[PDB]
Structure formats: C-alpha cells, structure tokens
Symmetry: C2
Subunit: 513 residues, 2 copies
C-alpha cells in the first residue's frame, strides 16, 4: 500500500513545456472503444517561470489547455497556452507582470489574475476556462484559440467564483462567490446562468443572484472551492480557512498571504431551497476540516446526503503545495507532509426537518448510515460523519462521478486521483455504499484526475470508461500517455502514447462529438 518514488519522476509534472502549432497523432496500444467520440479537454499550468523569474506555487504557472480527440479508435493530442492578460503581458514584457496565487510580481487599480489554469466548463454554446477569480476566458474547444476575457463583475455582484460550477441537464449553470452583501457585512451569493434561450443572446448577460448565504465572520469570508447541488437544494460548507480582506486591500503581497485559519468555529454547513430561492436557518455544525471537492450530494427521504473529500485540521492544505516542496526528493516530500492535515472521504447527513421534541437526540433515522446529527438546546445541529475512505497521507481526491445521470441524485460510485504525500500516483474507484475500492497503478507513473464517460446506451451507473492523462518518464519509455480504463473494475483497456512531456493538469471534461 505504501508505494515509493525514489526516482523522483513526479518532478516532470512541474516542468515547463512548449505549445504545439497543430495536433499530434498518438500511438495506440490496446483498443480505443469505437463509441468514444469527442474531446478530452483539461487545464493546468504549463509555464512555471517567465525567463528568470520563477513561479512559486502549484496554482501560479500559466494556463495550458490540453485536448485529446477520439474518433473511430484513433487519438490526437494538442495543446495551446491560453492567451490571457497574465500570459500576453508576460510575453510582451519578458517578466511576471500579474500577481499569481503564491507569486507576487514586482513593478490604475488592483490587477486580479485571469490565469485560467484550473477548469473548463460550458455556458450556452460556449466553453470557458477559469480559475477562481472574477475573470473567465472564452476558448474555442476545437482549435484551442483564446476568444475573449469576461469580467463577471460586469454582470453580477460577486468578488470571485469557484472553478466548480454545477451544470444541470438543460445547461443551467449555478455557482458561488463571496460578496459585500449586506450593511457592513460579507456574504456568499449563488449565481444562476440560464441555458441558451430563443433570442440567442449571451446567457451570462442574464445572470442573476438566486440566493445569499450569511457569513460566520463579518469581514472574513471562508475560502469556498466547490459546493453541492440537488434538484431541490443547494449545499454550502463554510470551512475555517478564512480570507482576510483587510490584509489584502492593504497590499506588494500575494493571495496566499491573506489566508488565515479560524481555530474555534469548526465547520458550518448551510442549505438553501433552490426553487423557492430561500436560505434555510438550520445551524449545522461540525469539527474542523479543509474542503476542496464535494463528491456528490442528494436527497433521501427528508435528509441531504453530503459526500466530501476532507482534510482533517484547520491549517490551509495549500501551504504544502509550493513547487519547491513538490520538486524535492521523495524522502523529503514525505517528511514535508508529516504534520499536514489528513485526507478522509466523509459522508455527512443533514436532517431537513428539525423537531424541538428531539432535542438531545440523533435525528438521522435512516437505516443505511452511521452518520449522526444531534439537536442541541442552543439549536445547533452537531454532525458526525460516516467515513467512506481513510488512508495514511493517501488522499482520494479530484473526485468524479457519472455526473450527467447521477449528479445531485442517489448514486453508488466515485472515481478519484490517489495522492501519496501530495504526489499523484494512482487512480481509484470507490463504492460509496459498501466501501469497496479498486485501484490502478504502475511504478513511476503519475496520473491525473480521472474523467468518467458513459457508454451512450448505458443503463448501469459504471458502464463506461475513465480517461486519465499520465506522465511516465524514464529510459526506453514514452514520456506521457492518455490512459483508458474500464470503469467497472479499473482494468486497462487502452493507452495513447505521445513523445513529449505533459505537465500536471487539474480539471477538465469530455465533450461528446
């Protein structure tokens, strides 16, 4: 179970690469399924230094857009840097011009980064690469050309937005960002972008605030990375990782310098009625953790099931993700993670109906969970999770599901990237009911978030494949490849090898063609 990486091949995930001018034909081993037709689109950093000025953090390198195309069993690979302000101005001036998450730039107002290195998602007929700021970047998903920059503040009152909007079957987009909501107060706004309507105009110009969540601290919003969505409810988790706005507006500093941990609050969970557009005043509380990715959320009788990838503790996990740390040799990478928060997959169960006559008791009356929710006299509901996966410094992270058909609904399976002291080195499948797992790994191979693609005529939940981009440096070996696994048991079906390196990618999607 404890796998070692003494060769240090994971360092290639963080080495600069060049863009291609046209797509590259990939060498196929095994058999690419013939129904797999479309484009795997993924974002990540590709330039980790501008000349002699280095980027310091994992989330600083300049956005590179990757694409693997699949048709009739053949595969191509293409990549282009996103022509953002951050990238363009850095190429023009031959230096780092915009301040990135953990890299301050040396020398009009505050120039917020639009380095869209995190994720890509559809709004209407368009696709937008994003990071976590107010700026998103329209891209062409066939050529990978950078179409335009969009400033979300032109359309709605929010200071940022997550790279994990939820998208319903009709194309309706929901997302969360903090704002200066009320009188002398901070809040978090849920924005809804409708699908493309008859009049064919930009759906973003029809953005609106659906509902607002209160903040635990008047002047300090929590860092929100993702959130939960069901047909009827929105779920938001407020962690003790706080953004100090006073400290940001003072400054030259970077984004990381403005984060702090609130030691006493623990985690507050909030639910809103999605259709009635109304915050529900249920004071759900639990112990402290970092949270980046919701796995999935759904309704079961009068309860919300909330599956989370947690990190136990209140220190901000991103402190362990500086490039210097991740480029260290293996023994030192392990040492660096010794005092880090511990990863754990957790199921929380939130009762929707709080009856006073149950004060002091466990309200989770469901038959198939060990999660609990205690109603206290002060009207807080204290929650304990059911643990679904727990491995020592072995994270099930970057979770993916059969989203289109089981997102926001009762489900059984999640796929994830396994992180070993923060270094990605395996792919995982988790049965969230039985807790059985499947694993894929090979020595000296470092994979990316697995994306699920259904067989188009699937009736079962895991009838399909997962795709992952893998780096595998070494003598007598192709430096990278696209991996295709059978979603049933994570056995290898095919892989598509390329002869150039591919750096780390965070998120992406499969666009059926």
């Amino acid at each position: 179970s404890q796998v070692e990486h003494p060769a240090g091949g994971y360092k290639k995930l963080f080495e600069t690469v060049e863009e291609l001018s046209s797509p590259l034909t990939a060498h196929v081993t095994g058999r690419i399924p013939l129904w797999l037709t479309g484009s795997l689109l993924r974002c990540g950093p590709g330039l980790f230094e501008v000349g002699s000025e280095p980027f310091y953090h994992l989330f600083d390198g300049q956005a590179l857009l990757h694409k693997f195309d699949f048709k009739e069993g053949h595969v191509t690979y293409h990549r282009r840097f996103i022509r953002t302000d951050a990238y363009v101005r850095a190429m023009t001036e031959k230096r780092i011009v915009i301040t990135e998450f953990g890299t301050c730039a040396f020398p009009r107002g505050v120039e917020v980064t639009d380095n869209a290195l995190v994720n890509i998602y559809p709004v209407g007929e368009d696709y937008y690469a994003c990071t976590e700021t107010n700026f998103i970047t329209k891209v062409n998903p066939e050529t990978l050309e950078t179409i335009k920059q969009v400033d979300l503040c032109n359309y709605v009152s929010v200071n940022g937005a997550t790279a994990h909007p939820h998208i319903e079957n009709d194309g309706t987009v929901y997302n969360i960002g903090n704002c200066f909501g009320k009188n002398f107060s901070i809040a978090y706004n849920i924005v809804k972008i409708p699908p493309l309507q008859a009049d064919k105009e930009d759906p973003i110009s029809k953005s609106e605030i659906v509902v607002q969540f209160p903040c635990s601290d008047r002047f300090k919003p929590s860092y929100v990375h993702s959130f939960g969505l069901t047909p009827n409810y929105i779920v938001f988790v407020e962690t003790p990782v706080k953004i100090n706005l006073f400290k940001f507006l003072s400054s030259g500093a970077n984004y990381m310098d403005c984060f702090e941990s609130n030691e006493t609050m623990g985690v507050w969970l909030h639910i809103a009625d999605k259709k009635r557009k109304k915050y529900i005043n249920n004071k759900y509380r639990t112990s402290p953790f970092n949270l980046f990715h919701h796995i999935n959320t759904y309704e079961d009788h009068e309860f919300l099931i909330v599956d989370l990838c947690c990190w136990k503790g209140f220190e901000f996990v991103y402190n362990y993700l500086y490039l210097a740390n991740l480029r260290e040799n293996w023994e030192e990478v392990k040492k660096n993670a010794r005092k880090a928060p511990q990863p754990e997959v957790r199921r929380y169960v939130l009762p929707l109906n709080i009856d006073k006559a149950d004060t002091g008791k466990n309200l989770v009356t469901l038959p198939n969970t060990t999660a609990t929710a205690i109603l206290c006299s002060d009207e807080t509901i204290w929650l304990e999770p059911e643990v679904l996966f727990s491995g020592p410094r072995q994270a099930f992270e970057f979770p993916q599901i059969n989203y289109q058909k089981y997102g926001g609904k009762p489900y059984t399976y999640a796929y994830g990237l396994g992180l070993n002291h923060f270094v990605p080195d395996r792919l995982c499948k988790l049965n969230v009911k039985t807790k059985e797992t499947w694993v894929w790994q090979e020595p000296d191979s470092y994979p990316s978030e697995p994306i699920f693609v259904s067989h188009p005529d699937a009736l079962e939940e895991d009838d399909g494949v997962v795709l992952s981009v893998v780096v595998s440096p070494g003598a007598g070996q192709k430096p990278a490849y696209l991996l295709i696994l059978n979603a049933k048991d994570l056995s290898e079906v095919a892989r598509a090898e390329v002869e150039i390196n591919i750096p780390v990618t965070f998120h992406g999607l499969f666009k059926k063609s």
Copy 2:
C-alpha cells in the same frame, strides 16, 4: 448484513431462571480442545422480578454467577445467585428492598446496591464479583459460594469503582472511581492494589491512591465505565454523560434519574504518568460520544494509541436499555433504536510531547494512522479519530483481546459482541491495523461477550479460542450452549449444549487450572 429476528428469541436473555444445586454435565458436539483446562466465570442478572415487583432496567436484575468447567474434553455447567445484601434481603422480605440502577424500591442511611451482576476479577488469591459501586463481593470460584461483602470505602476515599479494573501480570490491580477530592471539588482517583506479598495479608488493606484526575465540572463527575493502562501511562476519558450529585442526595428515586448530558463540553481525554504518579496537563479535546469499553491502549514512539468502542452523540446510551424495550417485538426494537447514538470503533492518537512551535499543525507524525491531533493557541489539542469499524446500529461491543500478553501493548486483534439495535446476535473479530473482520452468526442464536484463551504453545497473538455463552430457543433445539470458536478465523470448533435457559451475561474471565 441486516439480520432480522422476527421470532423474538432474544427475550429469553431477560427471563428469570433458577439456580442449580450442583453442576450439570453438558453435551459436547465437535471437539473441546484438550489443553483447555479451567473455568469460564461470568456474571449477569438471573432474577428479573421479586415476586410481583418487576425490575425495569438491564442492570437491575439480581446477580447470577455462571461457571463452565473444562477438563480433558468434558464440560460442566453450574450457576448460583450471589448472596448479596440486595438478594438476601429481597428473599427475606419477599420484595425489592434495595434501589437498583433503574428500579427504585418502596418502603439512615443511604443503602447503595451491592448487586454484583457485572464482572468478576482476581485480587491476590481471591476473586471478587462486582458492579459499579463501593461494594464488591468475594466469591469462591470452584463452588460459587458467596464469601463476603467488602466495602471499598473502608480502605480508600472513593464513592465507587468501575467493573473494569486493569490487572498487570504480577497481579497488581488498578482502577478508577470518583471522589470528593479537593476543597469544594470533585475528582477521580486511581487506586492501586498490590499483589499478594510475603506477609499474606489482604492486599485490599494495602490499597492506595496513585494519582488524581481533575473534573470538567466542579460538582458533576462524568460516568466512567472503564479506562486505559499501559506500562507507563494511565488514560482516562471524560465523557459528557454526567452524574448530578445534588439530584441524588436530594432523594425516592433511582440512579438513572441522576444522569444528565452536558451539551457543550464534548469529550476530554486525560493522561497520567503511572510510575511518577503524576497528572500530565495536556488538554486533549474531541467531539461528543458515550464510551463504555476501552479496547486497548499502548505506546508507540512518543504517542499513546487509544482504541475505543464509541457511541456518537451525548444522550446516555443506557436510556435504550430498559427491559420493556428489549422485550418488545423485533420491529419495535428497531424503531426504538432509530434515534439512538451510533456505535463506532475509534482509534485516537495522543501526542505526549506538545511543542508550541507546532501550534496550528497536526502533531500525529506516525506513518500508519489517519488520526490527527491539532495544537490550538489556547493550548487545547483537538483530536480526530481513525475509524476502525462502523456499521448502522451494529455495534462492535464488549471488546476482548489476548489481554495477558498484549494488554497495554502493541496489538493486532480484538474480538467483540455484535449488537443489532442493541440485541446481541453475532461474534466479531477485528484486525485493528488492516480493518479486516471475521463474523460468526447463526439464525435465532444470541451470544455473549467472547473471551479469548491462548493455546499453551501459541506463537501468534490469535493462536487460541474464544468462548461465548449462546442462547438459542426454538422447537427441536437445546435452549443454550457454550460456543467455542477458533480465534484465527472464528470458525466453529465445538459447542457444549445444556437443556436449561441461560440469561444475558455481561463480563467474565477464564481461570486457568
């Protein structure tokens, strides 16, 4: 996994029986191991009503002492009521005379029960049956005669004592009970009874207070059921189940009426240096749970590993253990448990060395756990467990280990009784490192706490058997039997059937002969 008991045979665990005048030869099926030589001694209630006056709670029925003897593959069974004050006076007066845990008796000073229905343990050359009060009862382990009543208050300043003293290899006994310790204050005392010394006098007359733990509340001690012991440390867990002494001394009421839950404190964990006899001022804190049984505790580098059978929530679990509830039909037993705390086996890891320079970080630097301990600025150490077993209303309870050789030391295996909505219906083995489990169960069979007995030539931790007393009522069937399982995989080795019923038993021991 969800086993049903529509026939309601579990009710026989709570039906009055008669004592025997001499031992009964048991009918053997399979093969009793020839090295198994000695006496299985177990305590439990055997009289659930005095004439027409009923006892109400599981911990009220009058103490019955059971014994299965093993020699050269043959088995006898014997049982006698313990001639306590509670029992004797009830037979004399033809009514309930002493107030039991959940049964008040109708008409100075305060007459505290000596109903020794819980456990039996050795002190020097003697054996004592006990409950949780200041009165313990010397018994003869061969004849099952009741020798004498001992009032612990004659020897040491404590108001009670648990039924789970720890006993070292040399015979030294440690235990915990609360006391009016300091000025205007409550505390908990650790008492040590030495082994039988040269002068041959009663070791109890040489009892002494080793160390004292402070209380979270000035006038309200927590209910303490058991505690942890290693070669060098004592571990005590202070739960939010509190005893209200003011409410007790006011009263006619019973013991149960004086319990309450503190909603805000959570759980406080305390450690004392055993050899230097000194409380260590480390403020370990975690979320609320009920706790009855420590599984085992041990030292690993500079950390205490603390394995616990927990119930998630602060409502007192004993509220669900009234005889009326446990005698209900199956569907109503399940309904009654719907809002109960959820059982969970948990490993906590307590750092012994708290360095201020790690404030805000996880101090658990061990490689093979996901347990964490966060050092806060206010100097509390917040703890999160590693979950070892978690099943919906399915408790791994009444834990036992290879105590003599692995108690207080690094270990791998625990055995337990599986409770299904509080009804015992299976036997379990847990590998505390890998989390693999083994299960024994048969329809309509309701077993007792499994006791481990080692093979004389054992090379490994689980080389031996577990013994359990099982009730199995029904047509064409022996109403009860002693079950012998192989500790390796919990496969059946033998059983020793008797033709009379055997009610529920709580704890006991095997006395090698």
